[PDB]
């Protein structure tokens, strides 16, 4: 099960540290799970009942924070697991937030804008009881965005009776959102890639990078690592293929091209290569920013990268983890690496609370400052236990939640 | 599954009546399901995490109403199913209530009064979000009583900030409870036994009754059917055996004896008989007030009773239903027959809302008035569809919930 | 101290019954004591700070209930004591109420209607935090009336935001009050006088009564005992003197006369006598409805009445108590006898909650029904302990508050 | 009385300034005084009733702010007095806060961690009515700390229903507290010492300091005055004795030693001296940071210090005041000098409101900025009335509270 | 009608831009209009009923923001219109606020301070339902000030139950107000005058300015344009006349004189001139900061200024607009130019929400920063449509409100 699989990873770090048996049990089970079955009037006039979930795992360190998923395959399990991760993800970044998540079993594609807006409202009204700007602050996830998130904000105000706007994050800038939301995640990855370059003693200008995937994270990660760090993005990949060029790409251009034509492949001035080939390139840093299992048992021994900065979720598998650490390859974990979003999300909530908004430069600095921190905080725990950065991160996280849980 | 099994029974009556396809779907799924994992400090000092559930099925006709279960085998499914029934149960009785239920996976026997009181509080605080005197009014179920219910009421007031006391039912009389709570269910069964006697044209004084089981329901049903109706309880049964006496028993005495000595068996002036034998006695009315399946395929053809007033839950099985109706034997369904409890529970909530308490005679009259009603309301629907009383009851119920669901 | 003096009386009955030591301590100390110092703009333009108290003694059995005192000598102590009594007073009557009281150190006489209204509001606003229709429901006491109580009700609504009217009792009938408020107390005394007559085996028609005092309680007690019971009020008394007439007075007339001319004395057809003389008359029932200590050590042995129904507060002293019981003279205690007011006050609150008002006949029947009850409930406890009715009453009271305190 | 004694000090400055008679009366009496008697289940199982007090003196300028005291000798009086001071203390610092205080008559030493946590909760629940993040924000006092304060915060959330964390101050950093809490008070004293040096024309490097006492305040005052100011701490004292060294101590070391061994005495490289001796040393600045009355009539004439920066409460007595001012010795009053705590407490509340936390440097700067200010604001009023700094501070305070009281 | 006249101006810009027909309709009508008739006890003792209005036009972008008017001629119409403007005014400044306004039909002059305070409270209580720190934040307008505004704040807290202070703006600094309130508007005008000097390519030191009017705005506009910008205020005007002096005035002195003697006229060292004459002076920038219609059809062709910065409301008429733009004379619109007030008001509310107050320099910088912004944002839209700045401003405003309205 998706959940049990997560609890396992937790249990591991739970041992490396002397964590009270019973205390670990409360950190394991989630505080609240709300499942709702609500009707929605479809455009054609017939009513359709939908299943929705909102899970508040842990709240010891603050109000639950986590996105909402619109997928036809979403399951209580999946949600629980994702909520579970949020708890630690936020903890490692050191944010006054807890961990939660939610979703509705629905395929947005077969629903009209009117129907979506409708479902989006009924949902938020159905789970209102459990949420609030000081209890649970939803956010966009798969198949949801600033548009859906704005309907949420609205529906809430209409019920609550006054402007809240701190009830959800990821809202359009003109409606209480924050600047730097888009580049968030990428900038985070960049900050990490640099820091790793440091621990590895590599020179950002002389370094070469390979980014797997070219979505939001991929693009910005490549863009900023290239511009601000000065490294050479020698290869990027699409959902189709990849392109090489030891001379270095011009991410700027590559982006436009990726926009114009469905993919980065076909792009001239680039030696076509496969995705699995990219993962094995001879580069300093490899940023897996696409699908899971990218780095697995099969290629674990082939990776020549000195550092693997996880831009996506679960890019590398447990087995690959072991192999990679054995070979002494630094692997900056996702909970830390691609937490740049959750971080800028905290800023949005903050900016909202005081109805005063910071400009880009600030959001940037703040983001980089906390990334650098988290990185180091994890680093220390790493040496203190001689474990891999991923485990170190879970320990640090499990630590903070426990202490808070204890002090209360 | 326990739930699916109930949905089936519903689907049946759902067909006999022209019920909008999509409307039925909403009546099928439950509105809210809340699952909580809360810690509790055990006497010895260690913390133990427990699982609790509160389910609000339908609320169209009023706030959810249903007890709380303390059992180590309780499961989401079981709760959902039980909640589901409450929806129709209250509906057939015509009470301004919805349907809900809840429970905690715990064995009260291995917990100290201090620990119980503790767990009971933490629970009620954990599900507070979903309940209220106008949202969900819990009540005692298996392994919970006026004592547990009073800790509930207290804990609530301490949080809410003022005396509520309508937050839960089944409280001690001296703390906002209602009179006639004990004899409630039994009196209900009595009222039905009598009414079944009328439509059948039998004379209450000349009639003879056989009550299977001798718990709360059995005793009072036997007691009141004997005293107020004037019928002759010719046989009653224990969890061990049964006793016959065509002359007629003195329920009054039989009760004391049942108290003094663990059972009714051994009781002098009574021809010992088996439980399965009792079911086949030659009496006018047979009140199965014990275990389920009592009347099944095997004995279905043997029952000589003209009327079977179900004092327990599911005494007679589906197959037996068919056979019994085929043979033309009136079978007053449980949802109606043993709903005298839920009914007196409604009055308690009422009395509480206005902090004014009625005396016995009132509670009685009110109870009897509504039973008589429901009975007839069901009777009508029966002729209107030429179905058996049980089905008639589910139709009447499914009808009321739909209308309300429609009007809203 | 006034308070300690009360605690003593309590401690006595607390012993006669096996009451857990620590449980008795909580029943001793009061839950809440709020003291406020608020300014008030006087007519002439200068501000004057006033001291006000609101004390919620016990609340186990319901929301605190008790009047507000406007006196220049009121002290925290006095209030505490009075609140303390309310707790038991309501408990013996069996009302879903707790015990509270309050007051403001001010002499209404030196204040203009405008200033009073002002002070009355500022006060109620200052103690709002502690009160509510379900927390603490003030009422009129010394130097406060339906007028002051109405300003209270208003000020509350203006703050709360909606019509409450269950926030205080003793309001004008046209503004949420109840009928039968005036005759309340007296009717109570009447009911008791009659009941005392029963246990004593005396005939209501043949009986003779002597009422000491002629205020609200005195008049109505005399009026109703005469009209409804048929007894012969042979003597009544003023703050000046008294009048005898073994033939029997016409309370109806006596009332008018008492209105026209400052006193009952001077009234023709009446043999003038002193107050202390009245107490010793040779009558069946003596209703001390005036000042305290009326029946003390000095005259204790002189009283020839078979029953003393306390219409006032503390008419007879402790020593007199002993002597009287020794001599076998039934003494219906005040907490029970003159509780007819608090009782009709409960009804007012009830009628308010459901915004539906009962007519006189109902209020009467309800009042008498509960009086009869309380009387008997006390009677039983009396035999169970072979103590005097006053003690029996405190036990019954202390019992109910303990049980509730325990169940919670 | 402790209270009347404070009112006297107030009355003095009340005269020096033309303060409306009646307006002064409202500033004299406290707005709210809540006294609670609550039970607590002791480990052994028996219940023990405790007495707690919460007093909101004045609120005109903001919500009441003040710590909670756990002592067996605490009395309503003591609390009132302390609350009274908070009102002016915050006023002189110019903080949007009012004045309040509270305490429970209990000896924490005879209670188990479990019992304490229990009592700590029950208390906070009992005084919830009167407090809130915008009404009254408690804080730690004598015998209470971040641990007790965190149980408070928790208990509140559980009742309120959502994360507050601005309900109390002095919480652990990881649970909503603020950085710089420890060094707070000391840094304040430091800032003053410097400002006085300024006014006295002394050079921070050439100056010599003597700190009486070595608790939190003493240590940090000594540490920072030494490191940041560059002065020479020539003597510090314990609850036992003191140590001299005109060469200058190494507070850094002295602290460790004070930790290792119960006292600073015994510490080598230090000429042992008595406490009363320290007070008379020939130094520029003397920081009485220990017990009250330290500087009294007896030694008043002996002090050779040019400036006395009160780090504790009431170190110097009224008589000593007169003498000291007569001799022309600058005496920075406590309300101003040791208010660095209340100040950092305001920041904690601020950081909480916007759920964004500042880092040390900020908390420091903010603290110093306001201290510098308050100092000067007081300085001005001093010249405008040619009174001593203590009186100047009370005037400035009484002024601000009056203006606000007036504008409203 | 005042309202319809405003709707027209809107409709104009509404066309220049492709704005959905129906969307424009919602932007046209105001969301809420509350009219109240409340009594007030007059000093002499008689009650007088008053009429009050509070109008929430649009709220899409935030809570309604707008002052309160005390005038005997105020009408629903006038308010609606004024509210309507606030909506766009805040929108162009880009403040998280909506649009609202209110007023009471009363002449303050005939009311005593006591009566005013009274009325001020009753009013605020009557419109409480519609306002809040997150719904509608009143502010001072004609005939209301920090004093009235403080009675508002108080009355609210007394009802709400806790300190708010974000409920209204324009409060006294010592009571939650902000610094820089007075110079606000003027500074804004200054910022604009400079920016215009820029687009026109004029040198701030060489430029000459003529300010019509000498109230708050006029004086400060003149003061700051002179001191900070270095331009030469060659003429200012009173409600009587004006004074010329090509050498340049000393606004500093001119202010004192205007204070001492009722007007600027009579002031030596100044060539007296008429108001209509001033408007035609040969200066670079003309700041109409007095009455409306100042620049109309009649003088439209006479104005020699290269830039007209509207310090007042509607100084120039529609016809004059056309003529002025035709002649190519830059006209910085009022909604932008004299919005410096609303802007600093936003800051006050912000500072209040986090109970942390900024110092002058901050308030200034923030103000100038946003003014510069709005100016440019408007400038862009101006070129994108080749319309006059006033229209550009309305488009920019109508745009932002629509987008928000759409996203929701």
Swiss-Prot record, chains A, B, C, D, E:
In the record, biological process GO terms are: glutamate catabolic process
CDD domains (alphabetical): NAD_bind_1_Glu_DH
State if Oxidoreductase is listed as a keyword.
yes
Provide the assembly information.
Homohexamer.
Q: Which residues form the active site?
A: 101
| Name the record gives this protein | Glutamate dehydrogenase
Enzymatic reactions: L-glutamate + NAD(+) + H2O = 2-oxoglutarate + NH4(+) + NADH + H(+); L-glutamate + NADP(+) + H2O = 2-oxoglutarate + NH4(+) + NADPH + H(+)
Which GO terms of the molecular function aspect are on file?
glutamate dehydrogenase (NAD+) activity; glutamate dehydrogenase (NADP+) activity
The cross-references to SMART domains, in alphabetical order and at most eight, read: ELFV_dehydrog (SM00839)
**Enzyme nomenclature, EC number:** 1.4.1.3
Q: Which Pfam families match?
A: ELFV_dehydrog, ELFV_dehydrog_N
Q: Which PANTHER family match?
A: GLUTAMATE DEHYDROGENASE, GLUTAMATE DEHYDROGENASE 1, MITOCHONDRIAL
Which key words tag this protein in UniProt?
A: NAD, NADP, Oxidoreductase
Temperature notes read: Optimum temperature is 75 degrees Celsius. Thermostable.
What family classification does the UniProt entry report for this protein? Belongs to the Glu/Leu/Phe/Val dehydrogenases family.
Q: Where are the transmembrane segments?
A: none
Q: Does the keyword Signal apply?
A: no
């Amino acid at each position: 099960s998706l959940y049990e699989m997560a609890v396992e990873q937790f249990n591991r770090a739970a041992s490396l540290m002397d964590l009270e048996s019973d205390l670990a049990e409360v950190l394991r089970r989630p505080k609240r799970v709300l499942i709702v079955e609500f009707p929605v009037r479809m455009d054609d006039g017939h009513v359709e009942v939908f299943t929705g979930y909102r899970v508040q795992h842990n709240v010891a360190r603050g109000p639950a924070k986590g996105g909402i998923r619109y997928h036809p395959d979403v399951t209580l399990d999946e949600v629980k697991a994702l909520a579970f991760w949020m708890t630690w993800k936020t903890a490692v970044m050191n944010l006054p937030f807890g961990g939660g998540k939610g979703g509705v079993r629905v395929d947005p594609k077969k629903l009209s804008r009117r129907e979506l807006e409708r479902l989006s409202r009924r949902f938020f009204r159905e789970i209102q009881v459990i949420i609030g700007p000081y209890n649970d602050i939803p956010a966009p996830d798969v198949n949801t965005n600033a548009d859906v998130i704005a309907w949420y904000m609205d529906e809430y105000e209409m019920n609550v009776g006054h402007t809240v706007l701190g009830i959800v994050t990821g809202k359009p800038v003109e409606l209480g959102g924050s600047k730097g939301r888009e580049e968030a995640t990428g900038r985070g990855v960049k900050v990490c890639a640099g820091l790793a370059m440091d621990v590895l003693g590599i020179d950002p200008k002389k370094a070469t990078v390979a980014v797997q995937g070219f979505g939001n994270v991929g693009q910005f990660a490549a863009l900023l690592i290239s511009q601000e760090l000065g490294s050479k993005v020698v290869a990027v990949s699409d959902s189709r293929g990849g392109i090489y060029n030891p001379e270095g790409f011009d991410v700027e251009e590559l982006i436009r091209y990726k926009k114009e034509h469905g993919t980065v492949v076909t792009y001239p001035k680039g030696e076509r290569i496969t995705n699995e080939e990219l993962l094995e390139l001879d580069v300093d840093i490899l940023v897996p920013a696409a699908l899971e299992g990218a780095i697995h048992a099969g290629n674990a021994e082939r990776i020549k990268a000195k550092a693997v900065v996880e831009g996506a979720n679960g890019p590398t598998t447990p087995e690959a983890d072991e192999i990679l650490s054995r070979r002494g390859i630094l692997v900056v974990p996702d909970i830390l690496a691609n937490a740049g979003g959750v971080t800028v999300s905290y800023f949005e909530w903050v900016q909202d609370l005081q109805s005063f908004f910071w400009d880009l430069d600030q959001v940037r600095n703040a983001l980089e400052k906390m990334m650098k921190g988290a990185f180091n905080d994890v680093m220390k725990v790493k040496e203190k236990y001689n474990v891999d950065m991923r485990t170190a991160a879970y320990i640090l996280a499990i630590d903070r939640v426990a202490y808070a849980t204890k002090k209360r």
